[model samples]
Target: CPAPPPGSPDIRAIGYYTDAARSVIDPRLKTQNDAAVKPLNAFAAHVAKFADAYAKGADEAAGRCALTWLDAWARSGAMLGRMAHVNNDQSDYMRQWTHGAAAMAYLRTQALASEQQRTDIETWLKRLSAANLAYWDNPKHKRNNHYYWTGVGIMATAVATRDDTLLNTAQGIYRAGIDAIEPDGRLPMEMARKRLALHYHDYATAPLVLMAEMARLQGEDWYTYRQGALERLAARVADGYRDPSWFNTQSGAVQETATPKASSGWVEFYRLRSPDPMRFDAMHAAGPFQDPRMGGNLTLMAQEGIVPLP
Candidate 1:
């Protein structure tokens, strides 16, 4: 919170995580790590920090910082996509996803774009959409987390292109994922960890909420499932937050690991769709990452009517 304690250990730990992977088998791991994960994380943090600063009324400085990160994310995304071609490994798929999502975020900040900028973004959106479709349609894509992120990529592309087909496809993937949620509202893969159930709830719900919001925009019914599951999950997270004792067995993991922010912004969609004030209030009380500029341009939407990015 207080500038995240400069040169944060999380930064170094991630660096080591990628570095260790590189040392084991492929040198390209090091390249992808530096080219993709490192820059994406840095840009996300920078954008979040700048949003924090701006929300606190630091205007000009925040703009400068946001621009810097925008430029870096753009350059890194380009390099990573090209590097993927050179390396010829499917694992680089994540790089393309990261680049597209980050680019979408950057474009949302643009107030007035030149023709060239508009056309370039449109082209990038098409490429991102095609790549995301390839991943979703491929039988080889294995990770469960990919379902969540691929939804993000598709929704982002749909938002960029204003294409109903892409948006509907994204909604379908989310609905399928929700069907996998147990009657108890626990994601099976996440609950398998047993100890970090609440943490997974925090991590997993964000994309579901994102997908729900996309559905809402397109007049789709997927928001119903998103809202229901998220509300149930939020209640559980709220219980853990209120009674830390409920998480006794997970105290160590919760304390030692970085927990993602709650998807309070997504909670607004729940409130809107269900007409539930409690859900809205719960999200409001959740905290900082919901500050408009940070997560998904919700703040911008509140002021500007529609978020330019997906």
Candidate 2:
């Protein structure tokens, strides 16, 4: 339960990242809310769990568990494909993109995957890319969350397959989403939720960071357009943390949850790009995923093994 190593931004970020990732992977928490959603959640959960375990000094355990999860997660996506349908619920899309990316990470972790397993993972990536293409090719579905999830799906597919098509798709969606934000850096639609502006920031930025990474990988620039906006946004969030008056008037009235379940990813995202130590501090204060014990355990792994950001 000792504190994670000091002076390691990348490690700090991954510590929280793995926590959020693992939340989606825990089998006990899996939901049967929708046919399309369950498998996707399961996939994300597996990836997050594997990464968390690896980050926490359970490398051998993570490797074995990730392989076992990938085998089933990939097949589940295939089963969904055979059903000949898909839906675009916010939760569902988030789960799918997260799950797909997690599968890719799991595959990369395995030093010697069976040929069949490798093929299965590759096949899943192809299907995921095609599904993303079908989803984003349409001009009508261009809402904020849609673009966000689409960006995530494309980025995950791109990384898994090393295909430029997926990267291009991710860049396009990211561009459109950033353009939608107002001059003040607020997502107008997110603000429309009135009191929940901070909540929207918490929700939306995860995909933005995911897309930003995709753009970075492909040597494209995404943050330039939104740099001023994100800075403003980050400043506002920081103010809210410091003084309650800075929060959205609507949301400020409600008793806010202190738990950091939703905003962990944003903490990591901002830490990597903004050079803000407070963001990491906010994350640590928010505590680990759901359990302080698990969070403490994972913090150790993050310090020891998580990859340093470039």
Candidate 3:
């Protein structure tokens, strides 16, 4: 395999904001943050293509291509160092996002990886997952969407590497998220986002939904863990998207229309497990949802059995 593009081992950037509520935009900071992670975005795109190809045809060649790219990043010392962030959680967020993205690709191509490739890639993932675990496990870190996402990241690594420790920790996070769900199915932290409350609810639900699927794959009934707390939360989000009036009233701000492609990418996985007609019809109209961050076209992955419907 040829050498891959350079990777950022140390991504240093500040938060995207110019105000206190974190709702204001700082274009310069945002651009800098985006630039710092450009390489990872490109790498994620390559992984998505490989996974889609393998999903389409079970092509070992495509699987090999994915492994080669992952191995190249592993060899390039990517994400092995402590990322520098002045006063934000962006670094840890990037770590978990990268961890989740790479693990999704690895799951697609695990059968095709060489022993050396597996060793290198899994080692990197282990370290990356450990970093994610360490950060979110801290009580000081807010238990919000970021925490939920790290759980998804670690869950993917656990499934990929068959690490029980990582698995238990991820399950713990899932449980905490479930515990945090209010009676009305709204997450307190996400609902606190004011104007972005609906968006964060949608965002938070994605990782939890993904985590439930991964647990089901391992014969664990995580969906019902807390008497179907996840279901309640999922319902709230789906309904919120359909009618933002509730969210607007709760948060005291009008909700932005949640884009299916970005906010509801994980809906396919949820629908596969439950197949609720109302949710299905709503998301279907916005059909063919895709997100590189979630490892490509989720609708296709669910339809084609890319990750298999455990």
Candidate 4:
């Protein structure tokens, strides 16, 4: 092999889903894909953790610390400048994702902050959401979980800012997730991945659950909508987590990881509505809820005496 071209040609690469299509995405590549600078997951996790403490009305100074952390975050790559990370290497989607968690945190913290800080944060979130909406709502882009986080960002902004249209779009995204569930509770779009089926299922449910809970706070029963779609999803995947054998046996050949990907970390939120006591016990027994990709606040949220919302 003679490389008379440009010497040996240096190469250094990081992570990837090789084919990169939403339809029939490969599990191995999906697992391998690197979101090297995922600002949203970190942003969301910090805001979520802060919201947990803030909701308790417990540390006055810590709330300010949360504020300062966000001040730094908003100045970074994710929130700064126009972006369309929807399906690209650029981190536009990370900003949207992080802003969703931040918007929710804004909800829990606004009541405790100065009006200036409150308005400042609100304006920041709206900018991010608007940037996302410019491209996110195209007919071709509505079904995937990117829209899910996008809707969460808008929903949180709607709730905090009380914009009716924001709430409407937020509602649409929640409805989209509910609609995606088929009669058997399978998200066929996710199952198409075959090997990483449960992986994406857990990823997809977090936003819809957050949206439904948000709707509940506004005195809506979106939780039980569409034949109790969300509950069915949780129960279905929880069963799969409990028994990965049959799913593995049937879903066909592809390298799969046994690493736990269940979003049951959110059990406490559902415990009140569905009362999955056995699964609840198991969820807590396994470990703290620490998935940054879904905003990583379960342990803090669970330790609080009650749900934060009415």
Candidate 4 lDDT by residue in tens digits, 192-255: 6566776666667777776776676577777767856887777766666666654455444342
lDDT of 2 by residue, 156-273 (tens): 5575567777667767776776677666656765555434455565456656755665456456657787566665665555555555454456333432433445433445445556
Q: What is the lDDT of candidate 3?
A: 0.77
Q: Relative to the unseen true structure, what is the C-alpha lDDT of residue 52 in candidate 1, on a scale of 0 to 100?
A: 41
TM-score (all chains, Cα) for each model: 0.63, 0.67, 0.92, 0.77
Return the lDDT, model 3, position 58.
42
Name model 4 segments beyond 4 Å from true.
1-15, 20-42, 53-57, 71-80, 84-90, 249-255, 259-264, 275-281, 291-296, 302-310
lDDT by residue (tens digit), candidate 3, 1-310: 3346776677665678775545456898899888877777778778877777777764767778888988888887788786787878787788778778888788767877899999999988888888778886578888888888878668877888889998998899888888999998889888877778888888898888778777866888787677767778788777886788988998778887655665487788787666364665686567677766676778887666546222
Top TM-score model: 3
Model 3 residue 287 distance off true place after TM-score fit, in angstroms: 2.6
Q: 2 or 3: which has the higher lDDT?
A: 3
List ranges where model 2 is wrong by over 4 Å: 1-40, 56-58, 76-79, 82-104, 107-112, 138-142, 214-222, 242-259, 275-280, 287-310
Model 3 residue 259 lDDT score? 58
Rank the models by lDDT, top first. Answer: 3, 4, 2, 1
| Segments of candidate 3 deviating more than 4 angstroms | 1-3, 308-310
Error of 4 at 3 (Å): 50
In angstroms, the error of model 1 at 164 is 2.2
CA lDDT of each prediction against the hidden true structure: 0.49, 0.50, 0.77, 0.60
Q: How accurate is candidate 1 locally (lDDT)?
A: 0.49
